[PDB]
Amino acid sequence: VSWDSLPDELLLGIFSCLCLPELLKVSGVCKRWYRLASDESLWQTLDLTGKNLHPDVTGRLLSQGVIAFRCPRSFMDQPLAEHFSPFRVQHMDLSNSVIEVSTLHGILSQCSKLQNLSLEGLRLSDPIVNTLAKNSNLVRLNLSGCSGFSEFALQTLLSSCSRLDELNLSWCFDFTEKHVQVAVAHVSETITQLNLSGYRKNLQKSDLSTLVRRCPNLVHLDLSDSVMLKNDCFQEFFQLNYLQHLSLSRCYDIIPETLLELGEIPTLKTLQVFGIVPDGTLQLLKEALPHLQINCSHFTTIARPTIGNKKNQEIWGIKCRLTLQ
């Protein structure tokens, strides 16, 4: 008649139907009930995007065995007070959050199993980028908008991630040609998606050369805002036999006429060239290259956890079970 004595497994089965708040609620019913409420099968996926909490809490939560942690645009700017042990997280997004460089260092120091990570828009540091190098299994890394790290730390990180598939190292304002040269010289040759846009004057045709020479598998290559890149480099793009999506938006010194060449790349499916097509001619370019799709992707999807088609609450295809509404 009584519900206690009910087998543990079956309890977790009941617990797994509860929303984060409820789950935390039943946590204070009977010690055990509390012991199970913090199991691990229950904390597989967690979503606290936009939450403002203390790093100690988020640290304690990741220690309950979290695998996919969706926590972008969150607030965690107090100092870490606790110490933790290696975390299980393999999928995490802390992009555009407010996190102290130290706290970020603290959390990332416990990570080595990351497969998909996004620190987009976050201030980093050499220490940080260096412990990141612990995650030699990364397949998708987004550091777009990041800053605070040497070209030295960047190199070691890239020399570690040899199974990197998607790398978004764009708009790192802190960068110099040192970083860009390290970038193209050390990205894994297994890379198929690279968004290296935003370095305007620090990326030379030569670096494009290097890159192409080293990564024959590019499928997505975004070099938006690369002024030094003018048509005389298009030959390089032909070297990429799997190139499918190229972006050269705002590469000002490109004669509209010349873009016609790209149409010749057997595999090219889409091209973004915003800002270099004189008004009242875009439709001409479009018509001239009917087999391509021009200027239809305002945004990048490279290493973006949630490109979201309006309300995609999933990070890299993983829907989180625990969330706050």
Partner: protein, 143 residues
Amino acid sequence: ASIKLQSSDGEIFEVDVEIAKQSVTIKTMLEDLGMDPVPLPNVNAAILKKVIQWCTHHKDDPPRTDDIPVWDQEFLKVDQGTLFELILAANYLDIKGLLDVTCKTVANMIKGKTPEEIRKTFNIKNDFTEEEEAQVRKENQWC
């Protein structure tokens, strides 16, 4: 086309081979050691009847997120006593569908209810001091 299951108290039931196939426990048993009938020592006739009625209604279905289909809805409208075994039997016979609907119903009995109301309506103890009672409520503060 047909197999026989013997409940815990002895009563014998006859069902379709595949309708019983819904119980991974009964399928595991059928592959080896074979000849009626299949003995299920942990499920009495009353409970097994309900289980067989349930398994029969589904058999074959195209069905998402947590809902508790319109049918199972009232099927579980049974009193708390029977639901306790009904959810225990599902674990025992390993019938994915059943464990699902019965666990949610028990979950729904926890939604929007305080820990106090839980202790009672579910008849559970409370070995928490005031020392941890409130000390635990401080760790779930961030919510």
